[PDB]
Each structure stands twice: as C-alpha cells, then as structure tokens.
Amino acid sequence: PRSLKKGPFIDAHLFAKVENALETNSRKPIKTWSRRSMILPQMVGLTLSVHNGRTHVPVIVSEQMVGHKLGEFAPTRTYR
Amino acid sequence: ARLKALYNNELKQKIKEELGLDNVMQVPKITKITLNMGVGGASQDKKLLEGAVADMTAIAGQKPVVTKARKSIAGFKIREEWPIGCKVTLRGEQMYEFLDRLIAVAIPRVRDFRGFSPKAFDGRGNYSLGIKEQIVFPEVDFDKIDRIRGMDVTITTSAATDDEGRALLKAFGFPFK
Amino acid sequence: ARIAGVNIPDNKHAVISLTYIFGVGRTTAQKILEAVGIAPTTKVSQLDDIQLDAIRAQVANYMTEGDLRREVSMNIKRLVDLGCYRGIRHRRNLPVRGQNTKNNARTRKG
C-alpha cells in the first residue's frame, strides 16, 4: 500500500481545503476531484464530495474511515 | 449432592434476603430438569434410536423414555404413533447431582460459547437452554461416537416470575448472562 | 488430547495435530513447542498431560479460534455496514482483493 516511512499521501489542495474547513467546522460539502488522498483523523466528521468519474458523490467522513483512500467510497462502475 | 446440601444451608437464606420475600416458603426452587432429544430421521432408518438412547442414558444417568407422535403431518411424512423422540425427567437428589455435573463440566467444554441470552425465560419463571453438541458432556466417549447430535434441557422453577427465577439461578451460580 | 475446545487425533505428531486446530498452523506450532520442553517429533499420545497443559497455556496466549472467527465476521460486517466499495463487493459476492476476474471468476460464488 504505502511505505510507513514515507507517511501518508495527502494532496496539497485538498489538504488546504480541509484545514480551512476545520477551523470553521462548516458542514457544506468540500467538492473534490482527488480520490487518491488519504483520509486522516483530522477530517473526521465533515463531508466531502468525491468525483466518481461522472459526477461528485457526497462522503461524510465517519470514524471508521481513516486508513482508507477517498476513492474507496465512490464507486466508478455502475452495474445493475 | 453437594448442591442439594448447599442449597438448604446457604443459598435459600441468601435468596430470601436478596429478594426481600416476606416468608421463607415463598422462596423458589427447581422442581425438575427435563432433557429432550427429538430427531426426525429416527423411525425410518431405525438406527438412530439406539445411539440416541445410548448417549442420552450415558449423559443423563437415568433410563430415557421414547415418546410416540400423536399427530401425522403430510409435509413431515410422520404417521401416527411412531417413536420420533426420546426424553428423560430428573428431580430431587439426582437432579441436583446432574445440575452440579452440568455446571461443572458440560457448559465450559462447549466451543465458542460466551454466555446464555437473558431473554430465554418464557416469562413464567421456567428456563430453557439448548446444547449444540452432545459430545460436550464427559460421560460420552469421543472415540466410539457414531454421530453428533444436539440436546435440549429444561429447568422448572416454582416461582411464577422471571426475576425470582433468575435470582434463584444466580444464587446457584449458573453462568452469567 | 483436547486443545482449545476441540479434539485432535492422537495418531500423529504434536505439530501435525496442532495444524488441525483452527487458528493454528505448522510454523506457529513449531514456535510454541520450541519455547517449552516438548519437541515436535514426540507424538500426542506419548506426550504427558502436564506438557499438554503448558501447551494449552501457550495456545491461550495466542488468539483462539472462536475469537478469530468472530473477528473475521466482524470485519466483513464492518465493511458491509460501512458500505464501502469493498463492502459492496462482499455483499455481491465478487472478488474484493483486486484479482483479475475476466474468465476464471468461479472461485468467489462457491
């Protein structure tokens, strides 16, 4: 997955958006295109909107979600 | 009959004190213990009954009795008056000894068991438990065992109410819920 | 002999019998028997009861089979109730590990 020495991978622009949202505890979704960013304990509780390929789907970061990448909660293929 | 000796001396008084019952006689007691082993396969192949009787006799310590079906169902394909189940009734000194052996060995050997549900009581003070596997009891021998069969145990208590029934079991030490 | 709530056949070596116990493997059994006097060559029937008791204590240090089964079920249920793509995969009985399933997709359904 990722070498522990390199630490988590967290993209700079989502990082900036999430800290600027944490100082306010705002509830409006953070619409984001990067589904490769690590979910950290800091962003537990608020809501992002992760691109699934076609549109953005909301993802309310729960407690049992740190340790997963953002794109895991945004399915890309829609099969019935 | 260590439990029989113990109940009159210690457990009865503490049960009365714990429930704050006005009269000693009100204090509940376990009237009977019944073991039931109903199996549908029996009475068609006719080999199941002998092993079931053997294991039930070995575990219970008393001769079991073969019940006869009183109803016929097309779906189950059971005709009238066939020996489909075997049951035994234990009371008093022998019941207390069986209960001591059960608490001592039968439940701990059970695999993947944490506790008994607290809702098992019917609400009238009676208690019912089911044992997944007969092998758990020490009397039976694993080496010469034809097959594994589950069992049902029922405990009858004088108290009409579940809170007193549960306290009666708690005084005895039946594993926590 | 009886270890961890189930029976192990007595006709072969201690390590091989430990292999049969769920949640126990050959390498783990070798590790267990290295610490204590028991040797892997000796059979279970030959081995004495006190040795078996020390072995049970060593096994008890390790996570037991019922606990392991329950944790695996809990993790799968956590994925399902989380609803992640992995939980969707578990519920829909499709490979969640990312293995290529174009043609030989047989070994997920059963």
Added chain:
Amino acid sequence: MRKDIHPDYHDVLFHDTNADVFFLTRSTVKTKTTREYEGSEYPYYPLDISSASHP
C-alpha cells in the same frame, strides 16, 4: 427409581490441574486411573477446563 433398569452410577472425583480444584459427584463414567482422596478412593478423570476458571 425402579430396580435394575438404570445405568451404572457411582462416585467420581473431577479435578482441574489449572484451577487446582476438586469436585465430588456421582457419574456413570468409569476411569482407569484413580486418585486417592482422604474421604475414600474413587476414580479420576482429568478436566482440561473448569467452570470456575472459565471466563
């Protein structure tokens, strides 16, 4: 208790080595090896686990 129609039933001593606890109770099981007990000599069956030790 009808005569002669019941299984063999006799005194047994059940001990747990880990808990170092002795229990006395009458059981049909027969044991090849017996442990001496101050009250009297009855057969021995070992127990891997006991209720008291059980969590």
Added chain:
RNA sequence: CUUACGACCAGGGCUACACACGUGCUACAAUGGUAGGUACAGAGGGCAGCUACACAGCGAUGUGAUGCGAAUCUCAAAAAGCCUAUCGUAGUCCGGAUUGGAGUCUGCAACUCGACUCCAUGAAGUAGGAAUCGCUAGUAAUCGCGGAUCAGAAUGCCGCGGUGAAU
C-alpha cells in the same frame, strides 16, 4: 471534417461477468511431501547498473561498504539427482484457490488496478463424456536458468543447457 472528425489537461475505461469459448500453468500425490546435508552446467545480462562483505529483520528487503564498463567483480544459488528421518492410502504433513491482518519496495501517487513478504484461513480437485492434439532421438516427458519490452508489473514470448524413453 475544419471554434471541429483538429489541439491540450484532470478523472475514470480499456482490468465489468448469469454463461460460451481456444491457448497454457498449477494438481489431484508414495516414481511422492516435508526436513536436514551433498554434488554436476550451459548460455545471457550489468552505469536507463549488478553488488562481494558487515550489521537489523522470521521474511521480502534496509543502512553502510567494496569490485567491476567486465574470460577480472557481480546476478549466482543451478534444480531434477544422491544419504538419512518421517508421513503410510487418508480430501491426508496432498492441493494452494479465496479471504482477513500486518508489512517492504518502484513510483508524485498502488481505491478502481502493481508484484512480492510473514501469519491465519485451506475451495474444487482422488485422473476426467462424446470427441480431440503433439511427438521418430538426444527427439516426447521432465528441470530449472537467462534475456527482450521494463520506473515496477510473467505461467507469455525468444533462447539455453540436465536428465533422458517406448514405438
């Protein structure tokens, strides 16, 4: 066809399976599995680099350190094989699919979707229907070892040598 059928960029897709299908790989075990020892090559690659040796680690690999643009140093240890211990016909000490957990690396990034590492789990499969294919001698079968594309990604492909038949 020409403010688009041309040009750029992020995300995903080419990796989705109720099922069919042709190529192979690994098995179903005793002509064997696992543990210890112990031999016998070939050719090929190495600054878009292979590392002798020390220590950390069960491990993949990590930090140092050294030789070599190689008939010098190096990948590299060859495997089948030979000696002993054991398993004793059992879905097994066969088989390693699948999943949970932990991790190391390449890469800016490993979720869709990397190959490896250890722990646990241990599915089918006990020799295969009509039919069908290759092979005449160092050949069939069997054994591992290289190279190419390659930042990382083989059972494929292109080569190599050991053992070595019957007809």
Added chain:
RNA sequence: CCUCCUAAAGAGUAACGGAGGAGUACGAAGGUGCGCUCAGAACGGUCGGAAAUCGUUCAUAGAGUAUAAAGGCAAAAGCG
C-alpha cells in the same frame, strides 16, 4: 336397509321431493379391574419450519367416538 328435512312440538304420514351412506370390520376394536383426559391459541427451546417432539399458561370438548348423519357421551360411551 340406515341418518336428516319435508313431517304441521306423542307415534305414523306421499311425490321421478331436498341432502348423504350401507351389502362391512374386530379374538380385540368384546368382558372385567385399574388408571388417564382432547382440539386449539400463545410463550421458550438444536437441527426444526405455519405445523414433528420437549416445557409452561388458558382450554366442557371448539377434540375423539372403526364408518354416513342424528342423538348421546365425564360414573365419560373417548384414551391407555
């Protein structure tokens, strides 16, 4: 030949009137002595369910009475 209605509260009473059975069975399914009470509903309990067997609470018969229906059946005539 048997049961119900027609049949008009004793008996009896017709129609090519309205509805169903019989031409058997049992040496126990008879006799006696003793003992017992059913169908269902709900609750609890391994496989096990709508319903198998086990335990508990109600339950004058909502069951059973070899068989069609009427009557009767607790001293049961029902079940051992």
